[PDB]
Amino acid sequence: EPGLVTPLGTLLRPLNSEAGKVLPGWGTTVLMAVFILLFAAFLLIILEIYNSSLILDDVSMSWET
Amino acid sequence: FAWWSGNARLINLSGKLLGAHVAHAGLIVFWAGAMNLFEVSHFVPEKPMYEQGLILLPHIATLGYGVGPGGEIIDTFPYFVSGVLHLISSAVLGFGGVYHSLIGPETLEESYPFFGYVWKDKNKMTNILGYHLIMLGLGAWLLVWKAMYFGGVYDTWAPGGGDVRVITNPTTNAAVIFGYLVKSPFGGDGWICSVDNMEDIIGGHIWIGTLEILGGIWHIYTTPWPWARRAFVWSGEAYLSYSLGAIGVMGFIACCMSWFNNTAYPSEFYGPTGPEASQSQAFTFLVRDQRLGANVASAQGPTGLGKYLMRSPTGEIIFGGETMRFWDFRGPWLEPLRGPNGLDLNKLKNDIQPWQERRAAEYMTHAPLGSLNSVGGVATEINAVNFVSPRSWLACSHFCLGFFFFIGHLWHAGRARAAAAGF
Amino acid sequence: MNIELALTLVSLVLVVSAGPLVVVLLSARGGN
Amino acid sequence: KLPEAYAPFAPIVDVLPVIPVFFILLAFVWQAAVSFR
Amino acid sequence: FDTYTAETSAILDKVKVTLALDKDDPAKEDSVKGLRKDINNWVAKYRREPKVSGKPSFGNTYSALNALAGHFNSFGATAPIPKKRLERLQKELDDATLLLT
Amino acid sequence: SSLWARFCEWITSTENRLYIGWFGVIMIPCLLTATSVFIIAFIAAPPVDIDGIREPVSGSLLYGNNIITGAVIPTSNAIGLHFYPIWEAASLDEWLYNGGPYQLIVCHFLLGVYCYMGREWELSFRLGMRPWIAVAYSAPVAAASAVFLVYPIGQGSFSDGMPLGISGTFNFMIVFQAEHNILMHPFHMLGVAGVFGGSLFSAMHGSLVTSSLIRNIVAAHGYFGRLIFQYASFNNSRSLHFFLAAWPVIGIWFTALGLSTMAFNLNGFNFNQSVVDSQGRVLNTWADIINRANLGMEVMHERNAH
Amino acid sequence: IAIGTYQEKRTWFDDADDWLRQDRFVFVGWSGLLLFPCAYFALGGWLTGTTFVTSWYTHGLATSYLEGCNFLTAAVSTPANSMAHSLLFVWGPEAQGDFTRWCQLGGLWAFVALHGAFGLIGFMLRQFEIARSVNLRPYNAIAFSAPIAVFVSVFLIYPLGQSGWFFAPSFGVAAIFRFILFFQGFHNWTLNPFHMMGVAGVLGAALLCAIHGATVENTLFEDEETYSMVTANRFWSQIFGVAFSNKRWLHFFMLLVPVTGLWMSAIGVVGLALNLRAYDFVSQEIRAAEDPEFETFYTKNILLNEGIRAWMAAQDQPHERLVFPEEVLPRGNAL
Amino acid sequence: YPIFTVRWLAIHGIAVPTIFFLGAITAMQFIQR
Amino acid sequence: MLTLKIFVYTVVTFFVCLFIFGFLSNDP
Amino acid sequence: GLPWYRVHTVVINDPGRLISVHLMHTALVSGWAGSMALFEISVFDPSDPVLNPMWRQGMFVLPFMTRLGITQSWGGWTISGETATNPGIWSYEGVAAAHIILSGALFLASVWHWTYWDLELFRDPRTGKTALDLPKIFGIHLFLSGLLCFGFGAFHVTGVFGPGIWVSDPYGLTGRVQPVAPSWGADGFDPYNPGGIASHHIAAGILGVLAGLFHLCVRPSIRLYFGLSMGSIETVLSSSIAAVFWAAFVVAGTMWYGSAATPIELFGPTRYQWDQGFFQQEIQKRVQASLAEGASLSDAWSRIPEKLAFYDYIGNNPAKGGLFRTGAMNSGDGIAVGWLGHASFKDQEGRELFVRRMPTFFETFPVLLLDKDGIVRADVPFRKAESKYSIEQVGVSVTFYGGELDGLTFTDPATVKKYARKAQLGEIFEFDRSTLQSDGVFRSSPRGWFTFGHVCFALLFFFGHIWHGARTIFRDVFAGIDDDIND
Amino acid sequence: ERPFSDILTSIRYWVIHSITVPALFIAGWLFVSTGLAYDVFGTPRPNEYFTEDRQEAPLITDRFNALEQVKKLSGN
Ligand SMILES: CC1=C(/C=C/C(C)=C/C=C/C(C)=C/C=C/C=C(C)/C=C/C=C(C)/C=C/C2=C(C)CCCC2(C)C)C(C)(C)CCC1
Ligand SMILES: CCCCCCCCO[C@@H]1O[C@H](CO)[C@@H](O)[C@H](O)[C@H]1O
């Protein structure tokens, strides 16, 4: 029972299709882990800055800015 | 039965059960003697007993051993003698328990039919109950004999503070003795805790001893009636449940008796009661203000306010302040100042004795309403005044024990009923 | 105060090395 | 205070009251030694 | 009621007699012991009777006799009674004697 | 048969929608009386002078009060432990003024709950079940007895009992902490441990059973052993369920005993000024802050103005 | 090696997974790497703080065993209010890498709290992992969500909402009692409907625990369904009228009641964290003020709270440098 | 039977600090104060 | 108050005696 | 068929009906935004923008509309108090009508995508079954999100094409919508730096565009596809719930502690500004500077702006509030109508006295008048208590500098006591409580209400992450969404 | 893996443990007694709670400059 066929449906069919295929093995998991670690470090840095734990000379961290 | 319920295996082992019960009795007597000796060791016979946390010594003193007028210690030797005697009797009882538990016969049913019993047998065990009831009656008559003869007991209601005296005319009237039982347990009427004279106590113990001896003989010589057999469950755990319920009731009664009564528990030894300390504080404040030249008739001075005197709900002159809740208190140092309509205005002035003031001050200092688990003090306390009244200890401990043994009544009664029904 | 008291306490607490006896039951399981 | 004839036994009577809990502890130790538990 | 008046009159009379003797006389002391025994017996017998307790004569007698017993209990016996306390005690005795009639 | 036999068999009948029983024969009038008096007093009752002085407090509705703050005031301090039925009062308004409804409610309600536990045992016996439900219910009734009774007995007046309300309950708890330091008492500690353990065990047992109930108990036991090192744990579900029941019941028993001990003035631990330096100066601790809070509560509780 | 239909050669991850999730006395798992260090260091830090670390500078109190404190009074107190919400790293600007000064400043409280929160996270992850390994529905983790919610709301969210970590609960017995009394005095926490729902949940959970553990052990057959359900239903229908028809519903209810009670309690703790009082019947206060004769238990509770605040704030908050003359301290006599 | 195993590490990391702290507290009990 | 006291005493006595008879009605 | 807590599961396997229900929720949200804007505009009072600010009337969406640039209304008024001239299509009512029209259009589109769920797009050609390529969908929508982020950060906040965000001075006196130059330095991470917003959204937009391109052009690995259960919609639901409660926690924290994205002229001051005496310190510095160059106390205190003194008042503290105390801030303690002026207390000797300010923790605080050294020189004794240092006995007199009461000195103990009680709350202000029948108890600013709501929402969505992810991982022992894999 | 039963009965266990556990307990006793515990953890000795010119409890008032402030409050 084929569904309705619309010009937008045919236009967007390639995007919804191609579904389910994967790269064999671990793929690019190590790059993702490196980026996750970098983002965790960045979050720690901004959290310390906003908690006044990390005091940088350039930043003020007060209402007087 | 597992290891923990191991003693439950001794239901049918008559010899071992007898040995175990005798051993526990020996342990009880050993604690009695050892703690009597311990309290004798730390006594300092120049300081009131209730200021040293002594419970057994007040019990011995109430019997009238080594006490004089005003609750003063004539000598300490009788307490040591009592401790030694209980200790040696405990040693004998412990040897007996050790023997009958292991060395003696395991079951007494076959070798000694007189000492053999079966829980289902409704006549032998009634004979045992009669024997031990006779023993209890003999003990009560021994107390009565010590009361009327062989010295006297410490009557705290004797004038001048109370002293040891010989009861000559115990209240043997049946109506007076048995009116306590039907007396309501509420304010003013304190059931059996409201007994205020030693004559009534001695007469009641006379009555209970005679009744116990007669009932022991009766239960010995009479088989239980068919309705009695039908109405009760006849098994060892059922008898245990009955005993637990009765002894828990006795524990609650003892708690209330020690907390509220000052006649059978003299205030010179056990300290002032709950209401007694508050009434003593009010009395001391009244006498101090009267000495300073104040109008004690109008309480602090306003007639619409009550701090030293107040009208009771029934219309009696009572102490003001919070002490309005304790207007049922009766004390040897306060009764002479009380007339028909509560406290007497005329007797409150120019009639207060110095010994009454001394007792009131002493009881004010040591209030049982101040206690913080061996640190003392009223309500929010920091340090000093290390006074927890022995009345508080006795009441709390025996109340907890009574509640636990009521729980025992529940548990064992349910189990016995289920076992008899077959569940 | 005295170090000899410390020696008495170490001798006493040495026999508390029966801790395996506490956990042997927990290791008595088969799990297979 | 104990009589002077029995004064030296002060530690003994100090330790005597605690003995019953030592009895119950001894009962537990005996139960564990036979190793039903 | 219940022959209370006879014992009351007897105890009042013996109280007056005991107070009537000289201090240095040893019969004073012997009467002190006898009076103390009589006081204990009287109070033990009559403090537990509400019918007797309702009388105001009993209240006056109890107050006076308990004051006397407290006097003899501490710093008493061979110590003379204070003047004001003795006068109040005698006033209570007189009130009891008058009110029995 | 006879009318008496028919009535007896109806009372003992287990085929009714609601079991009555001989214990219930006493229970039902007591509980109904207590409920009716409680409803009437809570909805509309004159102010009661709990302190005994002529300063009444209004805890009933229709007198500027809502459900949260509403309560049935304990009887007047003037009455104390005296038995105060209606006929002993001079008039009905004077009876309401001194707080008689609280005493009536507490007496009939205590009788009702005792007969309720008796009825629970009676039905358990009639149905052939083991009678450990009654001993389990003995804990909440023990707490109720210690709170509504016993404590007034120890303190010497029913005005110290817990008011029949929400804000009244909170006031009672605060005053109890002020006068006795219940938090530091080991038995309220045991009660707290009991209720926390009851909640924990209920949650874990429910989760384990719901996970195991599909469409194994041994699989659940293995999971529990792997989670926390209790590979042995209990012998079977029998010991598990018995411990499950015993923990909260024992906790409530111990907390009732504790409240009774404070009723007889045996208060909890106090370590005020228990730490000092060489010079003897007092070093404060957390117990000192608790003592300061208790001091504030006590000084604000003492209405020594009349 | 044969994951899915296809297969790939084993790597270091496969060996690590095999080593971690193998059957032994102590199941480590992948969540163990987060659980065991964090929980172990939380317990160790708490024990060390209660044993050696003092609070003479953070709170002006003695809260360690060597200061003379017992088990009840010893605690790991929160840092001073001056540090506000500083995380207090041992290498941070406040401690400057000095362990002694870090302990004196109260950073051990932050250490214990953070490593213990991560230990709780690892514990629920372990619950999930073990449930997956045994192939059981993970209702245990869902139930354990409530304790973590309470811990986050009380030990983390509340101090963050307030001035600093100083007002968070200190890890101790008398300290937690002080915290309870603090919410009683300053927030009227009993009157809040959320702690009311928490009270109802915990009491109902205890009630259900006792009821279930009595009905079982009162309905086992005379010899998983070791107890008679029909007799239980008949007993709980003849008494109390209503009975739980099925076992699944009863156990789901026992799961649900405490968890939802604790969750509502945590929501109330958040509301307090923003200093949002609940159930403030101002009409009662106005009526009592204009009419001195009028009095209610609510007004008495308000007066008691005022007394608690005034008599506690002098020593509970040393940073405010507030001293109260005896004439201004509230008393019942003055009222 | 490895000399060092996960169980060995856990039991030692639990017991060794426990023994050290017990010895510490035992010394602590006899401080003159 | 006399009538109320009599009524309450009668009700309580009736209920208590009925309960006692119930435990005395063929119940061991 | 399904229980009440499972009914909306019926669309778990229909992508079209899933899109329909998501469209319906989106339409409801936009309709609520429009309706709330309309209601708040209808109830707003723009007459006094100083002592009756937009955050004291309970406005909730007006702060955001003004924050991103909407400062004019079709009623002829502006948020700055001036007279609007050519408000344009983008006013408050304009934005409300825009969100409402969007709601209607989305409702119609939801109806359409509901009645036509069966579409050939949702079916893959390999199997002919309804399947969604979740990684590719995520890549596409993340690319769109990053492009929108970069556009917003580079054209709106920067002001190259947009109006710019609301920027205010540190004390919230001169705030208005101005473009901000992006700050790429370390000060770009200053949370009170407006240029940090522009720099961050630009950089995050660029990174999001790159991440979308990658996650769109690179397929996931088999190990991650199995480990993360990438074939189920329940997985992505759980991860989205996690992300949204993280974002809610972060935004609630920023709102409570204050930042450049939450100006005090819009959401009100924070409690930490009152705790540390921010405005009090600024006012003291200003008056000391004025006194240094001669002048007088009256002139120096009259030189202080009314708004700055208004910020120094515990009534505006968000912590001072009640959960059930509904309504606006003006609904409790009344509407401010004027500033009385600084009240300087001097005892009979001549020493100046300062009132110990009320902390946030105390609903009621004792009235204590301290000296310069901190010693309690005077106090108001507790209700009907013995007095030893009462203002009657000490003889405290209060003089007023600046404001309505300038140069007036009161020695009457009743007035002095009343003014001391009013001054322990901060700066003394005049309120009218008859216009709104104010009950005199403190309400909470929109800052506190937003923080409470979104913190509670984040806490609940934590349990959402837990539950929906538990269903994700344990689908075998549960029932629900299907999954598919290939290669 | 090895059962706990056999380790309880082994010469190697009862020798290494018998020579190590008392050493650890003595180490703890000496750590407390020698005053090292006060120094390492900063807990003030009973004779130095109230140093000169500070007769009241300490109070940290500065967050960032708390190191030397605590050092000064501790009496150096
Ligand atoms: C802080 C810190 C650290 C450390 C950590 C740790 C991990 C520690 C450990 C700690 C510990 C780990 C300690 C130990 C403890 C223990 C103890 C202290 C013991 C206790 C016990 C007791 C107390 C007993 C009890 C009992 C029993 C059980 C039986 C009955 C009776 C009783 C109850 C008594 C580090 C390196 C990271 C660095 C940084 C800092
Ligand atoms: C659960 C961990 C408990 C650790 C041991 C608790 C008992 C500590 O013991 C405490 O040591 C102090 C040393 O001065 C003594 O002053 C205290 O009296 C004593 O209770």
Residue numbers in the entry:
A (entry chain H): 19 to 83
B (entry chain C): 21 to 443
C (entry chain 1): 1 to 32
D (entry chain K): 10 to 46
E (entry chain 2): 30 to 130
F (entry chain A): 11 to 225, 247 to 337
G (entry chain D): 3 to 225, 241 to 352
H (entry chain F): 12 to 44
From the paper:
PSII is a significant protein-pigment complex integrated into the photosynthetic membranes of chloroplasts and cyanobacteria. Its primary role is to serve as a light-driven water-plastoquinone oxidoreductase. The assembly of PSII is a stepwise process that necessitates various assembly factors, some of which are conserved from cyanobacteria to higher plants. PSII assembly is facilitated by auxiliary factors that transiently bind to discrete assembly intermediates and are not incorporated into the final complex.
In this study, we present the inaugural structure of a green alga PSII assembly intermediate (pre-PSII-int). This intermediate was isolated from chloroplast membranes of the temperature-sensitive mutant TSP4, cultivated for 14 hours at a non-permissive temperature. Due to the instability of the mutant complex, the accumulation of fully assembled PSII is impeded, resulting in the accumulation of the most stable assembly intermediate. The well-defined density enabled the construction of an atomic model representing a subcomplex composed of nine subunits: PsbA, PsbB, PsbC, PsbD, PsbE, PsbF, PsbH, PsbI, PsbK, Psb1, and Psb2, designated as pre-PSII-1. PsbJ, positioned between the cytochrome and the majority of the other subunits, was absent. Within this gap, a distinct transmembrane helix named Psb1 was clearly identified. As a result, it is proposed that Psb1 serves as an assembly factor at this stage of PSII assembly. Conversely, the assembly factors Psb1 and Psb2 (homologous to the cyanobacterial Psb27) are present only in pre-PSII-1. Psb2, composed of a four-helix bundle, is observed to interact with PsbC, suggesting a stabilizing role for pre-PSII-1. The pre-PSII-1 assembly intermediate at the PSII acceptor side exhibits a distortion in the binding pocket of the mobile quinone (QB) and includes the nonheme iron. Notably, the absence of the Mn4CaO5 cluster on the lumen side is observed.
